[PDB]
Design an enzyme around this catalytic site. Sequence first.
Site, PDB file in Angstrom:
ATOM      1  N   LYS A 177       0.942  -1.411  -0.081  1.00  0.00           N
ATOM      2  CA  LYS A 177      -0.091  -0.005  -0.048  1.00  0.00           C
ATOM      3  C   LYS A 177       0.815   1.453   0.003  1.00  0.00           C
ATOM      4  O   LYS A 177       2.229   1.158   0.491  1.00  0.00           O
ATOM      5  CB  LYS A 177      -1.156   0.076   1.223  1.00  0.00           C
ATOM      6  CG  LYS A 177      -1.654  -1.398   1.158  1.00  0.00           C
ATOM      7  CD  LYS A 177      -3.076  -1.212   0.610  1.00  0.00           C
ATOM      8  CE  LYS A 177      -4.080  -2.241   0.851  1.00  0.00           C
ATOM      9  NZ  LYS A 177      -4.664  -2.182   2.113  1.00  0.00           N
ATOM     10  N   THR A 178       0.223   2.436  -0.303  1.00  0.00           N
ATOM     11  CA  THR A 178       0.929   3.789  -0.430  1.00  0.00           C
ATOM     12  C   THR A 178       1.754   4.182   0.895  1.00  0.00           C
ATOM     13  O   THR A 178       2.910   4.600   0.767  1.00  0.00           O
ATOM     14  CB  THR A 178      -0.068   4.989  -1.011  1.00  0.00           C
ATOM     15  OG1 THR A 178      -0.347   4.422  -2.241  1.00  0.00           O
ATOM     16  CG2 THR A 178       0.525   6.376  -0.951  1.00  0.00           C
ATOM     17  N   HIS A 223      -3.923  -3.420  -5.030  1.00  0.00           N
ATOM     18  CA  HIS A 223      -2.471  -3.674  -4.632  1.00  0.00           C
ATOM     19  C   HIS A 223      -2.730  -3.696  -3.169  1.00  0.00           C
ATOM     20  O   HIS A 223      -3.490  -3.254  -2.674  1.00  0.00           O
ATOM     21  CB  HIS A 223      -1.427  -2.654  -4.931  1.00  0.00           C
ATOM     22  CG  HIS A 223      -1.964  -1.260  -4.524  1.00  0.00           C
ATOM     23  ND1 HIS A 223      -1.623  -0.728  -3.130  1.00  0.00           N
ATOM     24  CD2 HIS A 223      -2.732  -0.130  -5.353  1.00  0.00           C
ATOM     25  CE1 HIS A 223      -2.478   0.496  -3.275  1.00  0.00           C
ATOM     26  NE2 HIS A 223      -2.902   0.988  -4.396  1.00  0.00           N
TER      27      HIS A 223
HETATM   28  N1  LIG Z   1       0.207  12.593   1.758  1.00  0.00           N
HETATM   29  C1  LIG Z   1      -0.866  12.183   1.317  1.00  0.00           C
HETATM   30  N2  LIG Z   1      -1.854  12.611   2.311  1.00  0.00           N
HETATM   31  C2  LIG Z   1      -3.043  11.980   1.962  1.00  0.00           C
HETATM   32  N3  LIG Z   1      -3.646  11.205   0.858  1.00  0.00           N
HETATM   33  C3  LIG Z   1      -2.569  10.980   0.130  1.00  0.00           C
HETATM   34  C4  LIG Z   1      -1.047  11.369   0.505  1.00  0.00           C
HETATM   35  N4  LIG Z   1      -0.354  10.629  -0.608  1.00  0.00           N
HETATM   36  C5  LIG Z   1      -1.149  10.239  -1.653  1.00  0.00           C
HETATM   37  N5  LIG Z   1      -2.535  10.319  -0.927  1.00  0.00           N
HETATM   38  C6  LIG Z   1      -3.649   9.306  -1.614  1.00  0.00           C
HETATM   39  O1  LIG Z   1      -3.192   7.956  -1.620  1.00  0.00           O
HETATM   40  C7  LIG Z   1      -3.822   7.683  -2.858  1.00  0.00           C
HETATM   41  C8  LIG Z   1      -2.963   6.449  -3.041  1.00  0.00           C
HETATM   42  O2  LIG Z   1      -3.075   5.346  -2.122  1.00  0.00           O
HETATM   43  P1  LIG Z   1      -3.292   3.925  -2.756  1.00  0.00           P
HETATM   44  O3  LIG Z   1      -4.717   3.693  -3.065  1.00  0.00           O
HETATM   45  O4  LIG Z   1      -3.045   3.259  -1.215  1.00  0.00           O
HETATM   46  O5  LIG Z   1      -2.475   3.611  -3.810  1.00  0.00           O
HETATM   47  C9  LIG Z   1      -3.655   8.926  -3.750  1.00  0.00           C
HETATM   48  O6  LIG Z   1      -4.141   8.603  -4.832  1.00  0.00           O
HETATM   49  C10 LIG Z   1      -4.109   9.910  -3.130  1.00  0.00           C
HETATM   50  O7  LIG Z   1      -5.514  10.328  -3.148  1.00  0.00           O
HETATM   51 ZN   LIG Z   2       0.455   3.396  -3.697  1.00  0.00          ZN
HETATM   52 ZN   LIG Z   3      -3.328   2.549  -5.191  1.00  0.00          ZN
END
Ligand SMILES: Nc1ncnc2c1ncn2[C@@H]1O[C@H](COP(=O)(O)O)[C@@H](O)[C@H]1O
Ligand SMILES: [Zn+2]
Ligand SMILES: [Zn+2]
EC number: 3.1.4.1
Length: 722
Positions: A62-63, A338
């Site tokens: 994850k992000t 993912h």
């Molecule tokens: N610093 C941040 N604070 C809040 N939301 C974020 C940040 N960086 C990324 N995101 C969000 O997280 C999404 C990606 O998360 P994911 O679905 O886990 O890949 C992006 O499309 C953003 O909308």
């Molecule tokens: Zn991501």
């Molecule tokens: Zn994502």
Amino acid sequence: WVTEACAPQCPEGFDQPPVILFSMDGFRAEYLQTWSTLLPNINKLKTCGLHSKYMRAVYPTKTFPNHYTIVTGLYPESHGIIDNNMYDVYLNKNFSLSSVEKSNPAWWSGQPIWLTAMYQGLKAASYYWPGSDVAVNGSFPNIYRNYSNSVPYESRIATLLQWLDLPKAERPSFYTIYVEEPDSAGHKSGPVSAGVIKALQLVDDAFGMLMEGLKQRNLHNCVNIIVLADHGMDQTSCDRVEYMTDYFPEINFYMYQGPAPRIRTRNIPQDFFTFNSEEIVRDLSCRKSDQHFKPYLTPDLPKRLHYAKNVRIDKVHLMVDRQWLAYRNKGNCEGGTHGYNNEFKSMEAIFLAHGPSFKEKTVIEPFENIEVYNLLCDLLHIQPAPNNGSHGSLNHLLKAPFYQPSHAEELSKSAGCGFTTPLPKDSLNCSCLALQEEQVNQRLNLNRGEVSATEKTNLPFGRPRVIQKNKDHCLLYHREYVSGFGKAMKMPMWSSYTVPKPGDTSSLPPTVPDCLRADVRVDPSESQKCSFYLADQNIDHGFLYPPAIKGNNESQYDALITSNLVPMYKEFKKMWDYFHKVLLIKYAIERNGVNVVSGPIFDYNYDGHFDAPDEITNYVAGTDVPVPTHYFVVLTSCKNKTHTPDSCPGWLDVLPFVVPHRPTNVESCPENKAEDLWVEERFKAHIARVRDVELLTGLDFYQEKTQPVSEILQLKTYLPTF
Ligand SMILES: Nc1ncnc2c1ncn2[C@@H]1O[C@H](COP(=O)(O)O)[C@@H](O)[C@H]1O
Ligand SMILES: [Zn+2]
Ligand SMILES: [Zn+2]
Ligand SMILES: *[C@@H]1O[C@H](CO)[C@@H](O[C@@H]2O[C@H](CO)[C@@H](O)[C@H](O)[C@H]2NC(C)=O)[C@H](O)[C@H]1NC(C)=O
Ligand SMILES: *[C@@H]1O[C@H](CO)[C@@H](O[C@@H]2O[C@H](CO)[C@@H](O)[C@H](O)[C@H]2NC(C)=O)[C@H](O)[C@H]1NC(C)=O
Ligand SMILES: *[C@@H]1O[C@H](CO)[C@@H](O[C@@H]2O[C@H](CO)[C@@H](O)[C@H](O)[C@H]2NC(C)=O)[C@H](O)[C@H]1NC(C)=O
Ligand SMILES: *[C@@H]1O[C@H](CO)[C@@H](O)[C@H](O)[C@H]1NC(C)=O
Ligand SMILES: *[C@@H]1O[C@H](CO)[C@@H](O)[C@H](O)[C@H]1NC(C)=O
Ligand SMILES: [Ca+2]
């Protein structure tokens, strides 16, 4: 720049090269290998600079856990960001991307690279990055931007170029830049779609704008640029989703659904620790023949994942199969996602690098994102904060490395266990009716030449070093194997032996039955008794080194001793015996002989580190003999299969295993299934790095291999993938 040919040209003022860390969310390794020629700016970076086949992300893929891992060099369990959505029982607060709690510094542990540079006299700027708009350890980067997902990429690039135009005193040395694509498109239409192509072209234009912007400032060959991703992307289907309603008659629990599910109580914080986590995993284990998920109690999860030591990581975990999903009820499912196992090819991320410090036109073998932090430190000429990366394992990427690694210093020296008399002082309630004169103990007595011969064959990379203070141990030498015996635990820490390439499988000698005796070299007060295993009915004695693997019938007696015994559960013994009798022979043929180093692992507090004597909570009933939590098997052969492991000058090939020592084989679901259908699958599921084995044992391997430490670290951090 994009049409210009491949190139340390830094202009006036720029004494040290600036570092830019560029992230393109959800940019899987596959996108680069297939669509690179459609992306001219990223393709020039791939052609002129350095790139890995793939960069292994951290679990869950994850992000927020991955981006924070890149900047800290820590596993999510240590830095605290274990998921995008989580709950802390002590804080009694919920963390999410759409909540105000994401800005609370209480969630963010460790030291991100911007803080490391700031604490060491350098300035740091960031145009987005998880944690950069958070006052981590009471501090923000010198220049930062509060997250806003829709700000055009050109504006992000333009502001970063303004920061590079700042006077030397104000000008930052480290920069981060984050982009949402091709992740957003991946979620919408899947990894192989027109949406992702457009998104890949969009991120290529953004990178192109940066490089063209740098070229105008004459910084395109000065800046140490790193272009990477947090994770990969895979396709999802509404026809590929498992429902908890199909397993439970009534769902009273809370579930973090998707590719990396976590189950907890709804009644938080009162029922958090009270919650029957062990019941949930038991009620979800081997329910359906074609089950597309596996329940796990977090300490039982594969050790290489390092996903258990944190209160935010709920005890109930589900390991979801490739392209599948796990939801609470049938009441989003289409597109892509993912979060799955980091070993899955679809979860692999990109890694590209260019600049004066990096090697030009270089393709490097895959590596882990936990290693990036130490590299960023070497680039910025700063000392790294305690992390999980192996400092020096990424030196093959640099033209002139900043840090030179050295072997871990041995904390305990080998003493005692010398051959004095062939007569045993104590029988230790052991019996062997076959022995007739018991002077077979004379074979256990080895002269300097005999010791050197077994040290050449069974210890080709040198003895594993003891990186433990006050660890009383001795080395036991035999003609077929060498072991390092742990005096206090009454068993060996390690057992090293090189099996040669076998000829035929049909003619294989079985283990000598009902024969066990005391080792004359080790004192009876530091030895295991055969009677210990008669009292405890659940555990029985097992051989660490298999007696029948090498030599003849007379050679077996050198292994039918008290010093070669380890505590084993009956069910685990079925896996252990099958591996050494069938699988080990198969592996020995495939790689022209194999060196094996096996031993116990104690990690009761599941922190990925070897237990201290007071940390061990289970023992052999009525004795001080500890019960191992896991067993390691490190297979080492040579990359060039023409040479045997004992006589090889080039690079080595490693296959390490950290198999859980469990009383049941419920993890494999072997109901009405023979050992040839699940044992190998279970061993392969618990594959780890040599470094993982090292941390779990307090041992350090290959210190006598004539190769630089940096190259040995590459072998130790290597994760075998099938
Ligand atoms: N610093 C941040 N604070 C809040 N939301 C974020 C940040 N960086 C990324 N995101 C969000 O997280 C999404 C990606 O998360 P994911 O679905 O886990 O890949 C992006 O499309 C953003 O909308
Ligand atoms: Zn991501
Ligand atoms: Zn994502
Ligand atoms: C990012 O957002 C935070 C929160 O809105 C801003 O922090 C506030 O700044 C003002 C003025 O400096 C302070 O009086 C407040 O105490 C801060 N905190 C809060 C919660 O209001 C911050 O200035 C913004 N940063 C940037 C670069 O725009
Ligand atoms: C965190 O979020 C969860 C889920 O929305 C909240 O859980 C509820 O908690 C109450 C008790 O406080 C239970 O009776 C509900 O059944 C729970 N709902 C669900 C869907 O699990 C929790 O209260 C939130 N905590 C905070 C501090 O915001
Ligand atoms: C990953 O690195 C961190 C930091 O070096 C390790 O965590 C530390 O562990 C010790 C001993 O358990 C604690 O006293 C520290 O407080 C921890 N520090 C932090 C920042 O959490 C962690 O154990 C390492 N993980 C592995 C598997 O090696
Ligand atoms: C927090 O900052 C202080 C200095 O202000 C420093 O001594 C400490 O090591 C930092 N802690 C972490 C985890 O970065
Ligand atoms: C393997 O070693 C042999 C020498 O024993 C050498 O001729 C051969 O080229 C080597 N192969 C590789 C792939 O290194
Ligand atoms: Ca431990």
